[PDB]
Amino acid sequence: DLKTAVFNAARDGKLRLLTKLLASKSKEEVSSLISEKTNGATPLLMAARYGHLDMVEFLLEQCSASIEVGGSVNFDGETIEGAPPLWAASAAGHLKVVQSLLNHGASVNNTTLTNSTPLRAACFDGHLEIVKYLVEHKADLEVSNRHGHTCLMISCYKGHKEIAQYLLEKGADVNRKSVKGNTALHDCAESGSLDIMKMLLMYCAKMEKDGYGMTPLLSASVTGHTNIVDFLTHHAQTSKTERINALELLGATFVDKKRDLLGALKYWKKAMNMRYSDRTNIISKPVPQTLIMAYDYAKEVNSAEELEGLIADPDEMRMQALLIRERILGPSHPDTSYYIRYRGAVYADSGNFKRCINLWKYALDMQQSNLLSFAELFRFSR
* Cβ neighbours around 270 below 10 Å, total: 17
Instruction: Tell me whether residue 157 is in a domain.
Output: no
* Cβ neighbours around 126 below 10 Å, total: 16
**Residue 341: its H or E element:** helix 334-349
CA 373 – CA 350 distance, rounded (Å)? 22
From residue 203, alpha-carbon distances to 140, 190, 228, 230, 308 in Å are 19, 19, 18, 21, 42
From residue 49, alpha-carbon distances to 60, 123, 376 in Å are 14, 16, 34
Residue after which a domain boundary falls, among 114, 147, 176: 114
Instruction: Tell me whether residue 195 is in a domain.
Output: no
Domain coverage including residue 350:
238-378
**To 10 degrees, what angle do helices 314-328 and 240-256 make?**
130
> What phi, psi does 13 have (nearest 5°)?
70, 25
With residues binned 3-state (H G I as helix, E B as strand, rest as coil), the percentages for the chain, rounded to 5, are 55, 5, 40
Instruction: Tell me whether residue 105 is in a domain.
Output: yes
Q: Are 3 and 37 in contact (CB under 8 A)?
A: no
CA 169 – CA 271 distance, rounded (Å)? 38
Residue after which a domain boundary falls, among 82, 114, 146: 114
* Cβ neighbours around 374 below 10 Å, total: 9
Q: Are 125 and 95 in contact (CB under 8 A)?
A: no
Beta strands in the chain (DSSP E): 71-75, 78-83
From residue 118, alpha-carbon distances to 37, 77, 87, 272 in Å are 21, 19, 4, 49
Instruction: Tell me whether residue 50 is in a domain.
Output: yes
CA 218 – CA 189 distance, rounded (Å)? 9
Q: Are 85 and 65 in contact (CB under 8 A)?
A: no
Question: What value, to the nearest 5°, has the Cα angle with vertex 285 and ends 282 and 289?
Answer: 140
Q: b/e per residue, 147-156, with b = 16+ CB within 10 A?
A: bbbbbbbbbb
Experimental structure resolution, Å: 2.5
The torsion of the CA quartet 89, 95, 101, 102, rounded to 10 degrees, works out to 120
First to last CA, the chain: 34
Instruction: Tell me whether residue 132 is in a domain.
Output: no
Question: What residue type is assigned to position 332 of the chain?
Answer: S
Question: What residue type is assigned to position 275 of the chain?
Answer: R
The sign one gets for the Cα dihedral 10, 15, 18, 24 is: positive
**How crowded is the C-beta side of 99, counted as CA atoms within 13 Å?**
9
Q: Which of 47, 51, 49 is nearest to 60 (CA)?
A: 47
Cβ within 8 Å of residue 31, ≥6 positions away: 62, 63, 65
The sign one gets for the Cα dihedral 198, 199, 204, 205 is: negative
The residues facing 73 across adjacent strands are 80
> What phi, psi does 14 have (nearest 5°)?
-80, 85
Instruction: Tell me whether residue 12 is in a domain.
Output: yes
* Cβ neighbours around 221 below 10 Å, total: 32
User: Count of residues for the chain?
Assistant: 382
Q: Are 91 and 122 in contact (CB under 8 A)?
A: yes
Residue after which a domain boundary falls, among 48, 83, 114: 114
Q: Are 189 and 219 in contact (CB under 8 A)?
A: yes
Q: What is the maximal distance between C-alpha atoms in the chain?
A: 92
From residue 368, alpha-carbon distances to 46, 94, 334, 364 in Å are 47, 49, 12, 6
> What phi, psi does 281 have (nearest 5°)?
-140, 75
Instruction: Tell me whether residue 169 is in a domain.
Output: no
Q: Are 177 and 145 in contact (CB under 8 A)?
A: no
Q: Are 183 and 155 in contact (CB under 8 A)?
A: no
What is the domain-level CATH number for residue 40? 1.25.40.20
Number of separate domains in the chain: 2
Q: Are 73 and 61 in contact (CB under 8 A)?
A: no
Instruction: Tell me whether residue 146 is in a domain.
Output: no
Which experiment gave this structure? X-ray
* Gyration radius from the chain CA atoms: 27
Q: Are 117 and 111 in contact (CB under 8 A)?
A: yes
Cβ within 8 Å of residue 115, ≥6 positions away: 143, 144, 145, 146
> What phi, psi does 74 have (nearest 5°)?
-110, 140
The sign one gets for the Cα dihedral 239, 277, 307, 228 is: positive
